[PDB]
């Protein structure tokens, strides 16, 4: 099981260096590269213990791949719009026994870092559905990618609905998150969104409530 | 390099039913030393890639029977029977051979199920967020199939455009059905200068159009 550290921003023309921790073996490795709604493309390989490292054709000048027995590190330079995307390292071991890490975000733009505006998407129950009840927070105005959502600190999570952030006209990002609720259940017991925008430093612990 | 062409999108297919998708290439696919090292990867929706089958016909650890690759050559075959609704992604194919590892153009597996009828609901702007100058509307349409559906927005009556921004969850893993929200983002005063907002749905699975709403002020 390996973890990667991401969330990057950074300027047309600049360079970053992304880790890639494991914490169960160090053998065998393999990047790659996910624009934002595309296909997967291939990095490159490098032998944890000899840096015998191939590149693909458009990562030579731009990818440089390390460790330190118990990590690896991509580091790319000259970074254009066209980087802008996920980039993975995953450790194939030749047989059926294939982990990935959960990719890292590179942003890059001239935008500054905003942390989100969290609302509540108050439910009513008297002005909703019979059976169930959705309410919801808006996570509005933050820069760069991305957002997470949970709910009642990981607690509650059937019927939730996290949505794609949009790119609001104003250069700014927003998401919703809703979730269904039996309405009986209203005003007993709590819902609490918990947003996390790692870029900005910021937490928000939203707690959503019927409209008094 | 080598090229390799998927070339296949959705043809809904039911569950239980099974469902194959293509893998079209320029080499050999043929290591001499006896392997054929075509791999077959899902990318299930806001997740990591995993592995599937690794020698074109080889199943990785955890992925069941019903999972078989096997081709012609050149022309690769991932085959997957008793469909389950949590098989929705997108199926990749790669290969060891030339150096520069590439891969296709995926296959988004999208699968069929009953006619289901949204869920509207709407959602007036928070308190805090009108102490700034900003008022967000937003309508819910929830766990809807299939695909195609349509929703207005109404201020007073009156249809917008321009001023609305609509989100769209993927396939659900389990009920494989699609939700969907829509902002309307106006002015603090131009809010207040208005009483009924509505989100008007149409869908294959409503007898007439829904009209959700409230009135500013409760």
């Known amino acids: 099981q390996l973890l990667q550290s991401g969330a990057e921003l950074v300027r047309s023309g600049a360079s970053v260096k992304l880790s890639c921790t494991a914490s169960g073996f160090n053998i065998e490795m393999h990047w790659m590269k996910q624009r934002p709604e595309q296909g997967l493309e291939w990095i490159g390989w490098?032998?944890?213990?000899?840096?015998?490292?191939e590149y693909a054709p458009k990562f030579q000048g731009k990818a440089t791949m390390t460790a330190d027995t118990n990590t690896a590190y991509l580091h790319l330079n000259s970074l254009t719009s066209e980087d802008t995307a996920v980039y993975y390292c995953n450790f194939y071991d030749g047989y059926l026994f294939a982990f990935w890490g959960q990719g890292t975000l590179v942003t890059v733009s001239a935008a500054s870092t905003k942390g989100p505006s969290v609302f509540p998407l108050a439910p009513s129950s008297k002005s909703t559905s019979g059976g169930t009840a959705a309410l919801g927070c808006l996570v509005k105005d933050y820069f760069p990618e991305p957002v997470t959502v949970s709910w009642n600190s990981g607690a509650l999570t059937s019927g939730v609905h996290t949505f794609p952030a949009v790119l609001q006209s104003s250069g700014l990002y927003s998401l919703s998150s809703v979730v269904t609720v039996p309405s009986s259940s209203l005003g007993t017991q709590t819902y609490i969104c918990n947003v996390n925008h790692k870029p900005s430093n910021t937490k928000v612990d939203k707690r959503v409530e019927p409209k008094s | 390099d080598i090229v390799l062409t998927q070339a296949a999108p959705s043809v809904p297919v039911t569950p239980g039913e099974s469902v194959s998708i293509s893998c079209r290439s320029s080499?050999?696919?043929?290591?001499?030393?006896?392997?054929?090292?075509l791999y077959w990867l899902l990318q299930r929706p806001g997740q990591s890639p995993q592995l599937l089958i690794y020698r074109m016909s080889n199943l990785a650890s955890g992925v069941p029977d019903r999972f078989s690759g096997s081709g012609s050559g050149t022309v690769f075959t991932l085959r997957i029977s008793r469909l389950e609704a949590e098989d929705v992604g997108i199926y990749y194919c790669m290969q060891h051979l030339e150096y520069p590892f590439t891969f296709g153009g995926g296959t988004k597996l999208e699968i069929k199920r009953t006619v289901a009828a949204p869920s509207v609901f709407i959602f007036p702007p928070s308190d805090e967020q009108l102490k700034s100058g900003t008022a967000s509307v937003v309508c819910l349409l929830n766990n809807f199939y299939p695909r195609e559906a349509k929703y207005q927005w109404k201020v007073d009556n009156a249809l917008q455009s321009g001023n609305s921004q609509e989100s769209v969850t993927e396939q659900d893993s389990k009920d494989s059905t699609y939700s969907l929200s829509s902002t309307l983002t106006l002015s603090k005063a131009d809010y207040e200068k208005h009483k009924v907002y509505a989100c008007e749905v149409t869908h294959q699975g409503l007898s007439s159009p829904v009209t959700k709403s409230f009135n500013r002020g409760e």
């Open positions: 080499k050999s696919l043929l290591h001499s030393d006896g392997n054929t090292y």
């Open positions: 490098i032998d944890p213990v000899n840096g015998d490292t």
